[PDB]
Amino acid sequence: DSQTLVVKLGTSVLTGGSRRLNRAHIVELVRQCAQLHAAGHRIVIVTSGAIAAGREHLGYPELPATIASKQLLAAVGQSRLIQLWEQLFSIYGIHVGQMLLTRADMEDRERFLNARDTLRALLDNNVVPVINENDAVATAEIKVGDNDNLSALAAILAGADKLLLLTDQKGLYTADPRSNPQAELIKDVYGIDDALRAIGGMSTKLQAADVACRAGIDTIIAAGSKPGVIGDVMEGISVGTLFHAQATPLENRKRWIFGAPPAGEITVDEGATAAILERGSSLLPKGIKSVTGNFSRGEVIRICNLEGRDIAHGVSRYNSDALRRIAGHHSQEIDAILGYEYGPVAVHRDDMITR
Amino acid sequence: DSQTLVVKLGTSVLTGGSRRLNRAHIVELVRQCAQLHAAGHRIVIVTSGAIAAGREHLGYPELPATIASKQLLAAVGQSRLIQLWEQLFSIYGIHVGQMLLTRADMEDRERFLNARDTLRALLDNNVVPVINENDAVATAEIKVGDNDNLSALAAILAGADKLLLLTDQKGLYTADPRSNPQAELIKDVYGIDDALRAIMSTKLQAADVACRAGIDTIIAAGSKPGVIGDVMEGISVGTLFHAQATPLENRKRWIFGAPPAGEITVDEGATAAILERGSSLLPKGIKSVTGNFSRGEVIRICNLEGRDIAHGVSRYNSDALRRIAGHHSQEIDAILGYEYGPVAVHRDDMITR
Amino acid sequence: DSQTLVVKLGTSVLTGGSRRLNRAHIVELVRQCAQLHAAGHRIVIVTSGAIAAGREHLGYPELPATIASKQLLAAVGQSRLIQLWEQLFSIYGIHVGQMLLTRADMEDRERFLNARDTLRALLDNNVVPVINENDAVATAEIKVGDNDNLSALAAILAGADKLLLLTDQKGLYTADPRSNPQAELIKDVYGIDDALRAIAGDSVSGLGTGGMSTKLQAADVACRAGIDTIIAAGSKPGVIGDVMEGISVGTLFHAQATPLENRKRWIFGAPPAGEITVDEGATAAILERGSSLLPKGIKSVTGNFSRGEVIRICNLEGRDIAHGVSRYNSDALRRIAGHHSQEIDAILGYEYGPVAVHRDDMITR
Amino acid sequence: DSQTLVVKLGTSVLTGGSRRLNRAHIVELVRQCAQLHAAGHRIVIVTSGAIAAGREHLGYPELPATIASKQLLAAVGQSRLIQLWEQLFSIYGIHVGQMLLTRADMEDRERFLNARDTLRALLDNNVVPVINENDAVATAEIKVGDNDNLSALAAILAGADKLLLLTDQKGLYTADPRSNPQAELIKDVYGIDDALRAIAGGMSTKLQAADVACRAGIDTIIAAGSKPGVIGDVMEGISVGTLFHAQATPLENRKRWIFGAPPAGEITVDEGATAAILERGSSLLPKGIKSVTGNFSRGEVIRICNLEGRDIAHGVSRYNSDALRRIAGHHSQEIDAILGYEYGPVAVHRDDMITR
Ligand SMILES: N[C@@H](CCC(=O)O)C(=O)O
Ligand SMILES: N[C@@H](CCC(=O)O)C(=O)O
Ligand SMILES: N[C@@H](CCC(=O)O)C(=O)O
Ligand SMILES: N[C@@H](CCC(=O)O)C(=O)O
Ligand SMILES: N[C@@H](CCC(=O)O)C(=O)O
Ligand SMILES: N[C@@H](CCC(=O)O)C(=O)O
Ligand SMILES: [Cl-]
Ligand SMILES: [Cl-]
Ligand SMILES: [Cl-]
Ligand SMILES: [Cl-]
Ligand SMILES: [Cl-]
Ligand SMILES: [Cl-]
Ligand SMILES: [Cl-]
Ligand SMILES: [Cl-]
Ligand SMILES: [Cl-]
Ligand SMILES: [Cl-]
Ligand SMILES: [Cl-]
Ligand SMILES: [Mg+2]
Ligand SMILES: [Mg+2]
Numbered sequence A: 001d002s003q004t005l006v007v008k009l010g011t012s013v014l015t016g017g018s019r020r021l022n023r024a025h026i027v028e029l030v031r032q033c034a035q036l037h038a039a040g041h042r043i044v045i046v047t048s049g050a051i052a053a054g055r056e057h058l059g060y061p062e063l064p065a066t067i068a069s070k071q072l073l074a075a076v077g078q079s080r081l082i083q084l085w086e087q088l089f090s091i092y093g094i095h096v097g098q099m100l101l102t103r104a105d106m107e108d109r110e111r112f113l114n115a116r117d118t119l120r121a122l123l124d125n126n127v128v129p130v131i132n133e134n135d136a137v138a139t140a141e142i143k144v145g146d147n148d149n150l151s152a153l154a155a156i157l158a159g160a161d162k163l164l165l166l167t168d169q170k171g172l173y174t175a176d177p178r179s180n181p182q183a184e185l186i187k188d189v190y191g192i193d194d195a196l197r198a199i200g201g202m203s204t205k206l207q208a209a210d211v212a213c214r215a216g217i218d219t220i221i222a223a224g225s226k227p228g229v230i231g232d233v234m235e236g237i238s239v240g241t242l243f244h245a246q247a248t249p250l251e252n253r254k255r256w257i258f259g260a261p262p263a264g265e266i267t268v269d270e271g272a273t274a275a276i277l278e279r280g281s282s283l284l285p286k287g288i289k290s291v292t293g294n295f296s297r298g299e300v301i302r303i304c305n306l307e308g309r310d311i312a313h314g315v316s317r318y319n320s321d322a323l324r325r326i327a328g329h330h331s332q333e334i335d336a337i338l339g340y341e342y343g344p345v346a347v348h349r350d351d352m353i354t355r
Numbered sequence B: 001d002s003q004t005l006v007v008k009l010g011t012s013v014l015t016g017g018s019r020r021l022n023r024a025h026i027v028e029l030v031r032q033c034a035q036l037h038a039a040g041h042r043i044v045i046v047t048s049g050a051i052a053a054g055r056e057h058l059g060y061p062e063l064p065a066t067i068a069s070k071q072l073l074a075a076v077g078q079s080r081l082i083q084l085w086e087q088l089f090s091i092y093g094i095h096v097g098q099m100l101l102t103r104a105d106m107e108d109r110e111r112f113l114n115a116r117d118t119l120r121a122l123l124d125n126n127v128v129p130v131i132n133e134n135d136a137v138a139t140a141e142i143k144v145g146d147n148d149n150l151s152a153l154a155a156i157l158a159g160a161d162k163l164l165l166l167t168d169q170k171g172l173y174t175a176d177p178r179s180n181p182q183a184e185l186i187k188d189v190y191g192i193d194d195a196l197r198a199i200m201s202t203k204l205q206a207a208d209v210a211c212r213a214g215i216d217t218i219i220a221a222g223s224k225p226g227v228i229g230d231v232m233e234g235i236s237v238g239t240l241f242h243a244q245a246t247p248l249e250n251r252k253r254w255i256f257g258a259p260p261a262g263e264i265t266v267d268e269g270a271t272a273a274i275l276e277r278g279s280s281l282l283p284k285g286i287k288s289v290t291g292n293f294s295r296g297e298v299i300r301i302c303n304l305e306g307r308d309i310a311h312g313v314s315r316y317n318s319d320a321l322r323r324i325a326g327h328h329s330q331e332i333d334a335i336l337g338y339e340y341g342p343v344a345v346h347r348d349d350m351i352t353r
Numbered sequence C: 001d002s003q004t005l006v007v008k009l010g011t012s013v014l015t016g017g018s019r020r021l022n023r024a025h026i027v028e029l030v031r032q033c034a035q036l037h038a039a040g041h042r043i044v045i046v047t048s049g050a051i052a053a054g055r056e057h058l059g060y061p062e063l064p065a066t067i068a069s070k071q072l073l074a075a076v077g078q079s080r081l082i083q084l085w086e087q088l089f090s091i092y093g094i095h096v097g098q099m100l101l102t103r104a105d106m107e108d109r110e111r112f113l114n115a116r117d118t119l120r121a122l123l124d125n126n127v128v129p130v131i132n133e134n135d136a137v138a139t140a141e142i143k144v145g146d147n148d149n150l151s152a153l154a155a156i157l158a159g160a161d162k163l164l165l166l167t168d169q170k171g172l173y174t175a176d177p178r179s180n181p182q183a184e185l186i187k188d189v190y191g192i193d194d195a196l197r198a199i200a201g202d203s204v205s206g207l208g209t210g211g212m213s214t215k216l217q218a219a220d221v222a223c224r225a226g227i228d229t230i231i232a233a234g235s236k237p238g239v240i241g242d243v244m245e246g247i248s249v250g251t252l253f254h255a256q257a258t259p260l261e262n263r264k265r266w267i268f269g270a271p272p273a274g275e276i277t278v279d280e281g282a283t284a285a286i287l288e289r290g291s292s293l294l295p296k297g298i299k300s301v302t303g304n305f306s307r308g309e310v311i312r313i314c315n316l317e318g319r320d321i322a323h324g325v326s327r328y329n330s331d332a333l334r335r336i337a338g339h340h341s342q343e344i345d346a347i348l349g350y351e352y353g354p355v356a357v358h359r360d361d362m363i364t365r
Numbered sequence D: 001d002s003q004t005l006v007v008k009l010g011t012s013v014l015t016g017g018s019r020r021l022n023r024a025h026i027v028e029l030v031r032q033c034a035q036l037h038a039a040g041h042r043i044v045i046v047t048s049g050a051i052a053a054g055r056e057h058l059g060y061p062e063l064p065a066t067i068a069s070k071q072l073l074a075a076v077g078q079s080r081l082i083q084l085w086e087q088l089f090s091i092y093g094i095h096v097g098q099m100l101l102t103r104a105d106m107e108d109r110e111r112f113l114n115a116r117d118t119l120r121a122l123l124d125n126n127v128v129p130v131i132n133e134n135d136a137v138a139t140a141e142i143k144v145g146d147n148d149n150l151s152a153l154a155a156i157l158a159g160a161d162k163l164l165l166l167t168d169q170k171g172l173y174t175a176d177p178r179s180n181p182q183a184e185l186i187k188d189v190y191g192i193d194d195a196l197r198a199i200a201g202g203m204s205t206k207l208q209a210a211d212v213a214c215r216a217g218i219d220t221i222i223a224a225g226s227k228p229g230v231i232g233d234v235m236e237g238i239s240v241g242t243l244f245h246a247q248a249t250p251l252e253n254r255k256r257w258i259f260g261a262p263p264a265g266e267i268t269v270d271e272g273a274t275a276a277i278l279e280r281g282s283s284l285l286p287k288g289i290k291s292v293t294g295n296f297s298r299g300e301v302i303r304i305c306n307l308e309g310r311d312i313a314h315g316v317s318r319y320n321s322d323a324l325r326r327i328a329g330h331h332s333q334e335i336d337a338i339l340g341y342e343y344g345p346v347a348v349h350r351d352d353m354i355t356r
């Protein structure tokens, strides 16, 4: 009966397409969450518009074009956002909790699980988590990039049944509907390639839908201004574009790796790229061609092919220095080379997420 | 003329020694701060009371004794807490920005300088930064542990002239005013020494760190009228820990905030070299290594007693160090097949004590 | 195109039938009003819940059962109420102005016209008036008594096109729903009469609702003044919009074919400044033939009052048959009571026409 | 031990001299009250600045110069004001109740006692009454006129020990201080007389309030709101601005309500009767009545004027207006024969009259 739904709210929806947060639009979406919340459902908000809110409350000032100017706006803005959410949800006697996070908080299993328990604990006590990127205290490197992908990670953390991306249009279209009249809303997508047939605004949404679906979470893109949208999505009623989740989803045991930020990279053979992508094999040091960055065993890493194309992320069995030394060698050689040995495999397939 | 002050406010100050946040108490401090802000000074708040505000708001709910329970109260509580600070400051037409951080945000130079640039940017546009530990989202390993230490780090990050630790008593006394019936208030201190660490424990660490980065730091009572304004004028108001004559190289102040990635046990001969003569650690003297860590990450250095003598940037990864531990420097390349100089931890990337 | 609607929200609507104000319920109704306000319609709120807001805010204290305990709760609770309204309307970018009144504010034409001009001026500047009884500062004598009757008087003062009474039930049935399964909601009413009051009373069981009795008095007042008035369930989705559109949502008490002269609509709002007991024949004249009261038929006079003031006309049984403007002072009515109109000047020395209360300064029933 | 105080704050004090309400200046004074409230004392607030608040909240709109404009601003503003007081007071965990009144609420003994009982009930339950003139709903004829005079009446209603009129200067000076740097402050004042009325014109309403309140036995003070700890110092009786001293033996409680009544009509009175009223404290006989103005009934409060046109007394009329004209100028034995009825010999008894 009861379900867990992550709702992502873009800046356009929160402002109604303006430079000022629109408390009428927001209160109406809050009402819908309370409606479900009271029915025994578990609601997780992922909010944007912090920087937007910062500009407004600071009266739209002139600030240099630097990382730090965005961060100061987020610091001021995130404060104003959370005040808004806590207040509007208090109309319905619902409490909220502020969680700000980045990829850095999902770099170990242990830190991912810490975030999970918190998020669960809130929901277990009828508190609606309000999630946002920690924009005020984060470098570019450790950031998720956007709240679309963040929401897919929050869905993974929350154990969501559905993920709802509310946005400035009805869903995913075949062509751009603004320029082409023959453009048509796509009702259902059965795997992200089934969608990049026809289908720049929509890029990070498809990435989010890919991640969530692979983790077994249905994901829907719809218009926030659509009346009763959040309820109807809970009931499985067609409402925008439904990205149907993967039938046999990727092992929970390694879904946390979606959220990690790579600690370094490894370039790899054609034969090794083939083995990973064609057969889901483990990476052996045989096929390693170069190793970049300084990283320890247990850290997550990127695996690139020789054209610089990112092919997988995974947990590295050896440190960066050692990889360089066993690179190109057979597994039996490892012990002779390093003086130690942690198995025949540089990255194991059970600690790898492909693509 | 214009000065930057960091003001740390602990839960006892904020609650007034009660259980609920005391908005009458807090607004009087906000007022004092606004007074300095309007005179051109640069105020930074370091707030506690997130978890306190969380239980209050939730109605003192029965929860399991677990880290998640402490983090859920903080999640709710920091929301309640930042809302208080924003509202009370708008009375005096002053804005706040919320900065939540842990040691993990000061593990690189890059990340430490990012926070610094954000903090200063706020101050440049007259916004009062309200800083706190990111309790809601943090494992124990990356937590600073306390806002006394956090405020010292905030001071370094903010290029503060003064750090003000407001507390529930007059300051740092000799023995104790309760126990020994004369035990006076220590007006001034010149370097925290072990005889001074014999006698608040966390407040001394924070003072020590602030003083070594060259920041005058004061422990005073939050309920002393006009305390904040006084401290800014340099008026004797409690206990003043004087800043170190020649402060620690700005070049390496970030290391104060990095969480150690692992630990090294070191010779009695190399313990001497590090502390006495300020020398770089050579593998020669390493006895044991702990944890997975890469080159570039900050680590702990322990004497054979198990005592923390230094924090520094490791030149070699953890596996390397175990292989070159207890060898001469020229042995390195033969042992590893690579080399990153003769030194395990350079004194230029090290902090003593 | 644009209309003026007065919405009356009783305590149970505001609380959702609890002892605590229910902001989810209220904000939902603000939303509906903001919608109308954005579309250029002029909305007036008549709010209850002031005393209830007070108990809630003060933690349900034990207080003596006195007039002053109700008034302290009303002071504390009205402060809270007007906050709530203000804050909620601000979500939709709408301003509210507070107006507290009693019948005393409507005892003159002058003070009635003052209350009117202020209400009109708020509306002309797109401010929503939030009207209540001044329960914190009032004796029982100058009070209206209930906000249903206050809302009728508001609708008059605003020049409202419709009056909407939101309540805790669908609103006025043809029979008791529990006693009769075919009992249906009464859709239309063309004038309130005795028979209807009896239906309304037999439809609620127990010590019949003095409380719906007041809603019918409000509806009579409004209807006579040419204002359609509707009783409906506050918790009905879309109700306020549907009422503005003319959609059948509860019970529609139709305005009077030819309404009572605007000229004297303010008399509804005045608190009588004394009474006059009247003949059998003068009762007939007043009620059956819309005649003026002559001193001839006055049997007894009560209280101290002046010419120009409004007073109650009682029939011999004790029933209040009319309210109207007294042409003479009370002391003068005693001296001319029982005498013909040519004797007035010989009796008093002065004169003010032949009539104790004129039919054009009188509201019957 | 535990006294009752009425702090009156004018628009100037609330706005710090500006056209916006200064919440920093106001929270400072709220705090000074809460300190006494916590100490067992009973605090009443009389607040101006409702129209000030309306103009600000409405974004300073151009409105026609009419009474409906002032009233609409007061409706909007009175809502804004009471939020403020409630919110700022809740910082100190103190509740407020809103009381809005006019002279019409003090025209009977009955309505006056009702007010008093409510104001006493609030205070008894530790609630700070925030009082203002009901500007949104009131014709000019029933308004008090200004919050200074209203605060005196609140002081009477609340049964206060001290009345504090916070304003934007040190207190009452020997002359206007903005026009004179040779004008000293006045520390103490023992009864207001016509000579002092001259020396006060805007400060004119503060003397009227002080007068009313002192005759009711309430010490009243004019001090500067900006002055630090001024509220606390006043409660201690520390000299802080100008202290108007309470009448040694104050006007009967039995008839203090007459101060707050709005005159229903007026009576022009003789030269001799003026003397009998003002010098010898007599009851007004019809003998001395010269002319009567307005319609009024018996039991209503009216104004008595001397042959110049000055207000010499306020009092409860025994006969109605149509009658008082008929019996004016005649002896008392003649009343029943003229009117046909009687109500004693006296037009206005001295036990339902307040002089001056
Ligand atoms: N961190 C951004 C979110 C924008 C997005 O990812 O869509 C903000 O709150 O402004
Ligand atoms: N299959 C090998 C590829 C290297 C090769 O083909 O030699 C690997 O897993 O690395
Ligand atoms: N970070 C803690 C305060 C820790 C301390 O008391 O120093 C909090 O927000 O409650
Ligand atoms: N005046 C009452 C409401 C009376 C009624 O609804 O009839 C109140 O505000 O509590
Ligand atoms: N029609 C008369 C009736 C008086 C009488 O019956 O004597 C009146 O209006 O008073
Ligand atoms: N009643 C006025 C104040 C008048 C005065 O200060 O005397 C107001 O609310 O603005
Ligand atoms: Cl699953
Ligand atoms: Cl819905
Ligand atoms: Cl595992
Ligand atoms: Cl605010
Ligand atoms: Cl320096
Ligand atoms: Cl100070
Ligand atoms: Cl009409
Ligand atoms: Cl609707
Ligand atoms: Cl005199
Ligand atoms: Cl007395
Ligand atoms: Cl003080
Ligand atoms: Mg790294
Ligand atoms: Mg690590």
Ligand SMILES: [Mg+2]
Pocket (backbone or CB within 6 Å): C176, C201, C202, C203, C204, C205
């Ligand atoms: Mg029945």
